[PDB]
């Protein structure tokens, strides 16, 4: 089966690591961190890796039940799989699929719809929702053990024992004590633990090459900053590759970024079998080009193919 | 070019009218409302209609700049979601992604000033308000917060759910907003959809939508999931009749659970004489089997 990519343009793609549109392509050749994100991980032949799942609504989401308030106002939440089935910690994944894959204070909304209905309200359940923050660097962030905590500004109106959804929106801030580092993994089983079942790190191996990312700017609840989240492939590529499961005929798919108006190739890139891009570029920053561009698959090549400089 | 659908299962699909997973398939044969939603509208040959755009993050989203606080209510100029100015003369009902139903839409307004300062707050957009005029470039939102929204700064609305579905809330998923306000006619609408065949009813992809407070179990029904919109748009396969016969298959057992007609204008019907959820495995998926003729009768579900 021939390998293909979506023909969605840059302005028609979304981030696989946070629910955001892709804003710009981006490089940073002198990055010192190991790049080993766990969402947006899929091989070119369709194998999801890390904590990657298919729903855009599942990225950095949680589903479960609040147990009790804990002595901002903190609350303990059991977490299930996003489909509602109990999370089995013996499954060969780092954490429930969709779990955030970076250190920071993730800001969003906790909502609840009660299981029990009220006769005097037309046999309908009660509901509530409040702003909430999840500190993924906290020892209390133990999604691999089926349990996390969140904090709220709201002091009372969260219910114990009720179905609970976290909808991510952005970060609480990028203050130093919020520990935002997009390449630092959470410790999924808690303090002083070793993560397991991780998607592998990615890196260029050929001289003159660097990673090419799909970058999105992330909202902030407060503070000064212009934070971004870089993914290796957009969510729609993950969805496409998963469904197609086309055999990979070599280690690298050569792709060309094309302006569909002019048919012109702006640059070429290597799309590696583990699901990431490299380019030959000697600078950091955005790729300044119209957002109607898209990557076109041109041919299978080997690891030693030399790219035209961007 | 042969017609195809994604092979994503029901538990791998998302709603095209609100940012929610698909929870269940659903029918309501005795519905009295005209079904004429504007998000999640795409022909089988790939023509987007209504206010439909391709991003899951764009559904019920707004981008723009706050102008004035009025008596805590705030006016907001809205642009296209890509940041370009919205031209009210374009042949669309409203900026793409604009909500397509009456209600109080709850979410978060966030701002990043032109290292910049930021703020965000919970907000509500009443789409039935006379000040909900997205086709004219302006909407209003309310906050519980009394002051901390800045005028003239880039502003994003991230939808989360509904504020309320009580009797003051005007929630009706089939009532369109007046995109240009009171006393104006909506324009450039995607057409209404209905079964024509005796014994058939619409089949929806249903999602339960969160509530900020109060009582209720509200849902939003879309005609096709967002991934189908994205797929059809890219493929642009010619439609070889008015109806594509699809079978809902359990891929574990290989068996067909039921069949449906997928109509050219981008919606499903089934022969079912009961309302409510379809109780079927969420690992099922619709498989395209054949274009069919105008006398094709569905097996009853």
TrEMBL record, chain B:
**Where mainly found?**
host cell
According to the record, which residues of the full protein are present here? Answer: 225 to 538 of 548
Q: What is this protein called?
A: Capsid protein
Q: Which UniProt keywords apply?
A: Host cytoplasm, Virion
Q: Name one GO cellular component term.
A: virion component
Species whose genome carries this gene: Norwalk virus
Query: Where found in the cell?
Result: Host cytoplasm; Virion
Q: Which residues form the Calicivirus coat protein C-terminal domain?
A: 78-301
